[PDB]
Ligand binder design. Structure first.
Ligand SMILES: CC(C)(COP(=O)(O)OP(=O)(O)OC[C@H]1O[C@@H](n2cnc3c(N)ncnc32)[C@H](O)[C@@H]1OP(=O)(O)O)[C@@H](O)C(=O)NCCC(=O)NCCSC(=O)c1ccc2ccccc2c1O
Ligand SMILES: CC(C)(COP(=O)(O)OP(=O)(O)OC[C@H]1O[C@@H](n2cnc3c(N)ncnc32)[C@H](O)[C@@H]1OP(=O)(O)O)[C@@H](O)C(=O)NCCC(=O)NCCSC(=O)c1ccc2ccccc2c1O
Ligand SMILES: CC(C)(COP(=O)(O)OP(=O)(O)OC[C@H]1O[C@@H](n2cnc3c(N)ncnc32)[C@H](O)[C@@H]1OP(=O)(O)O)[C@@H](O)C(=O)NCCC(=O)NCCSC(=O)c1ccc2ccccc2c1O
Ligand SMILES: CC(C)(COP(=O)(O)OP(=O)(O)OC[C@H]1O[C@@H](n2cnc3c(N)ncnc32)[C@H](O)[C@@H]1OP(=O)(O)O)[C@@H](O)C(=O)NCCC(=O)NCCSC(=O)c1ccc2ccccc2c1O
Lengths: 301, 301, 298, 297, 301, 298
């Protein structure tokens, strides 16, 4: 009766238009305003290749533009059919990593790499998409989270982790790589500079409880219940003012993201201003080629 | 023998000139350089209305300008005479909240709102007064700390919380509101970005011990001893160089507050320069209409 | 000639007791005039001056029928005909602990029991944080703390003939290590700002305009007339938008304080929506809120 | 007319564009992207924004393109007026933002569909793309149109017809992001506040004096000079140009800025033998040998 | 058998050229790419005087420039021969502190102070050296860490602390001093603003375990094993890509250090660019006085 | 015509061994002159040049009788009469690991066992952090890293006739991604700074002055004479105030490092007080401190 798999097929439906997905799965909950986005290459611990990043971007972007979706659950499928091992995401697929970055290939191995096509590092675009979308993204760490996979959990708004199977391991420097952006600096804004430097410089494996104690993981859950708890967290988020939740996310981003953070938060303020009679008077005055009349609108202080 | 009330009336005296306070109480300790500032509307869990904010500002401002006061203890009176419930502060009084913010009213309910008078959100001014005053402000959370009340706690330099009665709950998004300034972004600089986002996005109730573990509460105390512990903390603060304590507070504020932070710290540096013979030579040379002589004052490196 | 046109201005009720500052409301416009009134010492401010200045600016901030503040200096000097906006802190009553309250004009009347203050910094923040445009009209010398006040204002207009900018801080052993210096660098760039402070030279209106700290140069007699024209153009726009724009300009430079002020106004904007009103109503009626009428935007 | 048709070719796959034009230079690694609604001073509606994003994104991913020229077509067939871009099309502005419509006017708005403000997405795309974007202001630049020039890396402006006018507060709108705060990092806080608070009209020469316009050119020569600038840019080390742009963005853009600059530093490390040894060791399931690679200081 | 001393004399060799050191010791490990740098005035709890600072800077600078050294262990020798008391570092030597700062003296006490020579506060230069050097610096807190000694610990990349003997006490304000830089503001980026303010404003003594719980100490070790654990941590660090480790340290520093942070990280990016064929084409074209040919080098995105 | 007036300058004791740099102290003023001395390669620096430049600037930093550093280039070139401030890194000894030490002048003599360095960045930080005003006198070409050196100096004066600013970094596949670029933008604004780097055009003294990166333009023969005048005006003010001001200008731009330096100086001011001394004395006398004589200021 105890399931080894967090996924409950009865609770989830495929999303229309996404039959061609190979490296990623995308479900919408049967009742809730919540979607499930998951890595789908468990044979390589859910390592992503450039095509994986493209699918992940497409799917997250679709969720961003779905008005009836409030929360994204980001996770990994499994286990490995080869050894039963569990993974959230093991970062960039090393098999198709070249001197210019991760390269598109016709097959799974290095020999099928299109040598004419320069490599990319555009998981960074997925990071920004997660960061900038006006919806809460909750990472469900159901297994190994290593390299770029570790950095993905870091950039999510919230993280829940499997007690039995979550393993956090920043392996970047082991393979001569490094996430010098959100993966490292933003980790320091969750667990502090000392712990963050330890995690990267020594590359040790941490449990869910250890990461929770340090401040990068919000709560620990039983593996079988990880998505159930995820859905409960999403339900609590979706039960509040969506307008307030949106502003709050951009408020938490703002200063850390400089002018970009201000752009997003100020953008939402501009939308709020557009709803007002005062802004409509401004529009109407222009269209009617007359001076605007601001006298009904007080100078708040 | 066990008091349900943290307040020890024998230890405190009313402050002269504060006759007319209705929403707030203001005491000076009988021996120590410490004052007690408290919300005084326990029947509504110490929610503040614009008049409450005005009294609070005036009282904190007086404490700021009192040379014989080193530490402010900010707390809530209680319990509710209606149900015996304890509160530090439950944020803005929802009864007089309008479309333009919290509105002045002649009575307690929405019907007595002065409709000719625009709403205000100027608890933010109290936040800055606490932030900018050259004295340590310790928040003693003696009960519910919710909404704007939670955010007041966040902005204080230090927080002590009642074991039995403190309950931290960020209810902003529940009533369609949000503190997008110190309430949220500054919380993240105490407990890290993941926990701060959790606290706001889910709006769960946290105990003193839980908040202490996350990093927003300095210590947990027995309810009956909360002000006693507060006074002990104040005494330790007051036993150090007042000049060093002043500079240290502005040093902690500085970068987080940008140019405002620099302004406050540099302002105190200017005062230190004014104490020197070199600065006195500059003033005198101008007043005597002669060139200054800097030769007695060596260059340091 | 004199930039002050007495016919255009009325005294503000409740301010009969002002000694170091004058305060007028325009006869027709949503504009006030705030001016230093010690031209015999080049409009140097003492602590009492600062108190009056703060109180008057605070009153303008809280006047809903006022949109723009014009900050300037009265003159000329009755002693030598010299023109000044403001020459900074009154050096006569500067002590080792800062500028001190005194019953008279000189150090001999200083209240020795009372520590000195530097709370022009409080006026700077009041100017910086108020949800209204403050225009500095530099009608003469602007030196020391007076120079730093023009720097922190949103806009500066300057008298062609008589405006003189001179950062004399380091000459008398002082320094504005806040807005006076760092924020000046965000107007004229780090090289020019360092020059202005390190060498303490005198600059004309036109020179400051070329460097970027002065918005426009006006004829002396027309300085307040041009100020009123600028104020009128500002007052012809959405007050809501002007308010948001000022705080947007402040935001990143002011860190968490900047975010607090801008987000504070964003919160007011949310409070105006039906969605926020449903949040209030549900709490008051002790029922669950119903968010279904309010769509998610992206 | 600044447009020289002989110098430009249409780009394959963009036959369906209606609000925007998109050309590639016949010889140079340079593209031309232009607003194409001159009858309303090149105001953009959400469809314009979608086309603009799609086109700039394509330019970003085109390895044989080094520089983007962003401008407006004209003149107005109605009054001969010249415009770069007048910002959001006010006719279809609603309480929820700019709304999709089947026609040009408010009565054709799809009421079932919420409005958007996603010109901000185009701003970020210009900002984050590893190529220089030069704005050619050939006419009116107002509202969101003014803000689009602000966010471009460089701006060249028509002496006779460029008109800069930040009208945001006139119509109760505001760009509280790059449009204003970033303008201040070009012309300084005093001038930026003046531009927004008063919303006056400025010439090319005035904006050049303030620091927001790199150079003024004769109207007929505006695109010719743009192409000359693009050529000088394309003649340098592309790797260095790329690093330079993100270095300029970095601190102003906080963690996002660091992410972009560090992303390119990561690529540079991937080129090294040391990084390749890291990949090889993992793939071959053996310990890495770092001894051939010395520590630098 | 149980050693009271963390130092294992068999594991360390003196470094050539440092025979003249008096206030500091400097060893290189017999096998590992690791050095040991230690305060050597245990009779005054390893308080530093200006000569100590000069030696410390010299030794750390030499380590910075040693290509075969990857990690610096920074600690204190002991115990005091007077009372057996243990110290990492008790900050500035108060005996030779004057009105212009810490002063050079021929002897140990104030009467041998060179009055003609202005005082200095240049432990700040050692702080920046630790901060900016492209190698991990691990602080081994083997006893008291107080005042400026506490701040040195704060600025190191990692801290390990002796269970039995580590005592953290920020005493600055007790003696009228303050570290308004890394000592305070950077501490806040490790333990959060509330705990950081508490540490300074109250100046209480904290254990290794307490500082670890707050986030300023990475791990607690047995006193006899402190340097053994230090060596184990260094070995894990030294087993990764040295290039990646370097980039990662400056990535963690970057935003916190503004333009200085950008300068250091960008400098390393420039070195990486110099390794490329493209950069070499740039150099060669200039030297051969011909136009560069960039056509072999793809634009990446 | 030469800007250098030999009569005004004396060699500094202990610096006889300098080869790539010259170092003089003024015969009367608290001012030194530090100059690149390889005019045959447009004053391009090699690693040895950087070491000498650091040592000389460090010595000036620690000299209590020196207030101002004038940083410039010697010339003209004995080969073609060309004038240079500094053309950046010596490309002849640039390798894949950076600029390399060599026994001779050319690439064939580089020590292959010794990795390259980019440590002109250390000189930039030394200029940036030293508590004294550094004025760059651009007497000729300023290119690459040489351009970045002027950018990081506090003030820049430039020769009308011979100053030439040209950011050639991207021409040779290099880039200054720190103070050279990002800090230039805080002088001339983001548009002009991007223009300067992306196109790498040559600009005159007058053009750079208009953009905001050059404080003043001077006649070539008078460049050091004007430099000495600027230094004299700087040296006539409170040294303590000038010091605080420089770190105040640095502060926010330099994050925790900026704060560290400014607060460090504030700590020194505090050490001068009776209050700080009571703290010391109480510790030394093993007694509680008595803070009662020292008032709380606000
Ligand atoms: C360039 C002038 C403005 C005009 O000179 P002029 O030749 O035209 O007239 P002058 O003879 O100097 O002045 C006329 C009368 O006014 C007096 N006076 C002018 N300014 C002041 C003044 N600030 N304080 C006291 N008296 C002043 C003069 O002494 C003189 O008095 P009289 O001989 O008729 O008896 C010149 O007077 C002057 O340099 N005055 C001093 C400017 C000054 O150093 N102000 C204060 C420096 S510091 C500062 O303002 C300040 C304040 C608060 C701060 C807070 C935080 C951080 C920094 C702060 C700060 O830097
Ligand atoms: C200064 C002009 C550009 C030139 O005036 P001119 O006197 O030469 O010609 P005019 O007769 O006014 O315009 C010619 C035709 O084009 C129309 N037109 C011009 N601009 C627009 C326009 N923006 N929207 C709709 N129609 C426009 C005019 O109504 C007119 O139509 P007609 O009566 O001949 O049939 C003037 O047209 C004008 O003020 N246009 C409006 C400028 C404007 O306020 N744009 C919107 C500001 S708000 C905005 O762009 C925007 C968008 C997204 C944002 C996202 C986040 C944050 C902020 C945002 C934002 O602020
Ligand atoms: C907590 C202790 C470290 C341990 O106390 P314990 O109870 O174990 O034994 P104790 O009797 O106090 O010390 C044993 C011997 O060591 C001496 N000693 C300990 N620390 C110092 C010390 N720092 N300076 C001079 N002597 C010291 C003691 O006086 C005593 O001497 P003895 O009576 O045998 O002759 C305690 O000694 C103590 O508080 N020491 C002072 C800590 C302190 O306040 N240091 C200076 C704060 S300021 C700071 O370090 C500093 C320095 C440079 C800075 C530069 C720029 C900006 C900031 C700076 C800065 O903040
Ligand atoms: C614009 C000139 C300065 C003047 O041109 P002109 O036509 O007047 O004279 P020219 O014939 O080019 O030069 C005269 C002699 O001096 C030589 N020369 C001039 N500059 C250099 C030079 N920098 N290195 C080596 N030789 C140089 C010339 O090769 C030539 O040698 P000759 O033919 O007599 O044997 C031109 O010479 C020139 O562009 N020189 C190279 C400028 C350059 O690209 N420098 C390196 C950019 S990168 C850089 O400096 C640098 C260094 C360290 C960094 C560290 C961290 C981050 C960034 C860094 C960085 O960007």
């Amino acid at each position: 009766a105890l399931s080894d798999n967090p996924f409950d097929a009865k609770a989830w439906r495929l999303v229309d238009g996404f039959d061609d997905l190979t490296d990623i799965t995308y479900h919408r909950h049967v009742d809730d305003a919540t979607v499930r986005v998951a890595f789908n290459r468990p044979e390589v611990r859910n390592a992503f290749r450039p095509h994986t990043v493209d699918e992940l971007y497409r799917v997250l972007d679709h969720a961003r533009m779905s008005p009836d979706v409030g929360v994204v659950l980001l996770t990994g499928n499994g286990p490995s059919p080869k050894d039963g091992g569990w993974a959230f995401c093991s970062g960039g697929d090393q098999r198709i990593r070249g001197r210019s970055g991760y390269q598109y290939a016709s097959g799974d191995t290095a020999d099928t790499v299109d040598v004419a096509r320069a490599g990319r590092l555009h998981i960074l675009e997925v990071q920004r998409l997660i960061r900038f979308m006006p919806k809460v993204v909750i990472c469900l760490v159901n297994g190994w989270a290593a390299g770029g996979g570790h950095s993905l959990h870091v950039v999510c708004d919230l993280t829940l982790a499997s007690r039995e199977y979550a393993r956090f391991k920043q392996t970047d420097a082991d393979v001569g790589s490094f996430d010098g952006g959100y993966g490292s600096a933003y980790l320091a804004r969750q667990v502090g500079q000392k712990f963050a430097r330890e995690i990267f410089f020594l590359g040790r494996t941490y449990t869910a409880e250890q990461m929770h104690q340090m401040g990068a993981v919000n709560a620990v859950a039983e593996h079988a219940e990880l998505e159930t708890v995820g859905l409960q967290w999403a339900a609590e988020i979706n039960a509040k003012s969506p307008q307030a939740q949106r502003m709050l996310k951009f408020a938490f981003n703002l200063l850390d993201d400089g002018l970009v953070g201000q752009q997003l938060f100020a953008g939402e303020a501009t939308r709020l201003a557009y709803m007002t009679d005062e802004a409509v008077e401004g529009r109407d005055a222009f269209l009617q080629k007359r001076p605007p009349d601001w006298s009904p609108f007080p100078r708040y202080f």
